[PDB]
Amino acid sequence: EFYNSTNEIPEEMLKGIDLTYPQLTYLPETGILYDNTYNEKTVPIISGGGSGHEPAHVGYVGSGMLAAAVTGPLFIPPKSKNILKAIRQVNSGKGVFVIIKNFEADLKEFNEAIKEARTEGIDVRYIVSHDDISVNAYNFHKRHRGVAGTILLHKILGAFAKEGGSIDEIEQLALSLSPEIYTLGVALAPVDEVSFGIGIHGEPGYRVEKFEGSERIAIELVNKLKAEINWQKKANKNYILLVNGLGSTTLMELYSFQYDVMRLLELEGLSVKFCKVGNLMTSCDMSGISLTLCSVKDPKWLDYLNVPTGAFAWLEHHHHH
Amino acid sequence: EFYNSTNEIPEEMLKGIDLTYPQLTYLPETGILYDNTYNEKTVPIISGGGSGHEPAHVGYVGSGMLAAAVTGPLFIPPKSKNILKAIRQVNSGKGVFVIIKNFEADLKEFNEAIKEARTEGIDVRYIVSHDDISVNAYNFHKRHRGVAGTILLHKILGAFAKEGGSIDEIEQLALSLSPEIYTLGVALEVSFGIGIHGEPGYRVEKFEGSERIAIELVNKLKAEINWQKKANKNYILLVNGLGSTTLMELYSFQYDVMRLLELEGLSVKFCKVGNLMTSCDMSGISLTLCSVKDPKWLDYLNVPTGAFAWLEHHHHH
């Protein structure tokens, strides 16, 4: 690799992002990247986590999405001191809402910062992203990590905030949305072998087999998602889909896979009302894909997904169409 | 790899892109992807080439950029019949402009279709992209392939077309822009000047950090551009990942490159970073520099498009 950020904030990367986008500024030595056009008129949403997953979360900072993201070393969450610094900065007395991915280390650092901010008079509220339905190789309980479906919280909560939602209303929206999101991934590795339900850090999949084409990979992931969501039994047939490359899978492979998945989900009697395809949350250079499904439980969520943002990894909107 | 499109149009990929994007339509079995929003009031620009370089050129189809792109099998240009299909469809008697990357096979196929269209009364004109300053590792003659800076042609000509540029004026602009564009890449041992299809670099050396890599690429770019001799110090920069290089590495590299360019006395006035034109899953980066020869070029770069790989614009700022 060209750079390695084991044990250090990726300072060069964050400075490069600042240099590229007029609307983003980075605070050196802190890992904090912020939307410099944010005017404090609406409730801010922030997030953060380890490097190694870009564009999560640096590519989701911008108008209509996150006001700031705090990035730590490779696969290590930011320190509570830098999280607290970011909370105080975006705060203006209207509350601050935090999205935290469900990892032990991330929980500890965010908890510590949020507790401290609240003692200072800041009304910080939070939701924990837990969409990963892969399972722990030891006892077969779901891992419940926060993975690529986290970005749907960034997008929907950011858009409702931008339209004027109060801190109380954003929390209630978060509590409704978060349970609806389900994500499952697969990786390839040479011996070629296919690991279904690979963890976001390479943890073992629930089943490994010889590669014999991607149609059967799509069938398996769809069948495993069906076992959790049970869409066969649910009246609302409308879904949001993400097809996410985990780092080294090509656009050709991602859109080919999207095609196979869409054909299967059509046969399941579902209507995919929104989809987004690309490297949305990676794991270094892993060769794999994850699929995220989320019920369109409120039709308004489609409006919130389609609205334009200033964040570099979500610049598209329905005025394109 | 989950799919392999050796020898065939990447039909599922194209169908998938179609399902994703309302403003894009794919024509089954042709490799033709088009902007279904295009209204024929302006001169259409089109391109194409083999699969394996995505988003070049499917990601650059949309309002303000290409009205269509024609994609062939892995590393094989589309057949002339499909190119000519595309030309006929975008045509409305206002001319049609084609951007062709400088590879022997692409030139044969596009030439066949262009001359055929011309004898059917279509005023088709073209420019050849040749920004690659890498060298054949024996003999060191420049290769002059069309590589990532091609997308500067798409964006500038597209935006000028969209603005109402005549076919005459677009060709003149294309002839002005094309010679300003210079691009060199590196793969990961480090191989400097790796070919776009994996051909050997001019020098292989041990990895000793990316600062020395930025220095070597900027030095080779300088040898061609000679920016120290020219009073206009304004440039456009692309930092392009060649397939499996991560965003962390690409923006880190941009940073190191911008540190050096500023010490050279240059003002980088527009920058774009990402997987802009790839080579399968190759681990590597290319840098493109282009003189802001005419200040209006920046307007053309900053204007909004509907193409999926180029959605940034100046209202974000």
Swiss-Prot record, chain A:
This is DhaKLM operon coactivator DhaQ. The keyword Transcription regulation applies. Homodimer. Interacts with a homodimer of DhaS. Disulfide bonds: none annotated. InterPro entries: DhaK_1b (IPR012735), DhaK_dom (IPR004006), Dihydroxyacetone_Kinase (IPR050861). The modification Tele-(1,2,3-trihydroxypropan-2-yl)histidine is found at residue 201. The gene is dhaQ. Residues 13-314 form the DhaK domain. GO terms for molecular function: glycerone kinase activity. Keywords: Transcription, Transcription regulation. The lineage of its organism: Bacteria, Bacillati, Bacillota, Bacilli, Lactobacillales. GO terms for cellular component: cytosol. It holds the Pfam family Dak1. PROSITE patterns: DHAK. Coactivator for the transcription factor DhaS. The heterotetramer formed by DhaQ and DhaS functions as a transcriptional regulator. Activated by covalent binding of dihydroxyacetone to DhaQ. The complex activates the dhaKLM operon. One of its GO terms (biological process) is glycerol catabolic process.
